[PDB]
């Protein structure tokens, strides 16, 4: 029941744009439930929003390994790669996000 509260704490801090503390409670959520792709995704979102694209790529990767149908994650890892000047993997991720968009 308990990463149902950590995730929500992280969510509540995310919703208010407090990424530093959002990360703190997203990481606690991931300690208890290391399988929830949604946790990997939102933690990926938090780093991305800070401009920590290196870590954003890292965490989106596993969110996409556990849920490859997450088109939003594909797209955001695509921006991350683009920011880093990785234009090949950016293209690669962008297309995969659009193939899930009718």
């Amino acid at each position: 029941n308990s990463a149902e509260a950590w995730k929500n704490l992280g969510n509540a801090y995310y919703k208010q744009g407090d990424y530093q503390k959002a990360i703190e409670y997203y990481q606690k959520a991931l300690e208890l439930d290391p399988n929830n792709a949604s946790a990997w995704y939102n933690l990926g979102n938090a780093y991305y929003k800070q401009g920590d694209y290196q870590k954003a790529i890292e965490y989106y990767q596993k969110a996409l390994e556990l849920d490859p149908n997450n088109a939003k994650a594909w797209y955001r890892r695509g921006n991350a790669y683009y920011k880093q000047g990785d234009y090949q993997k950016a293209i690669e991720d962008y297309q995969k996000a659009l193939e899930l968009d009718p």
Binding site: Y14, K72, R76
Partner: peptide, 5 residues
Amino acid sequence: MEEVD
């Protein structure tokens, strides 16, 4: 700006 699901 980006949303959340």
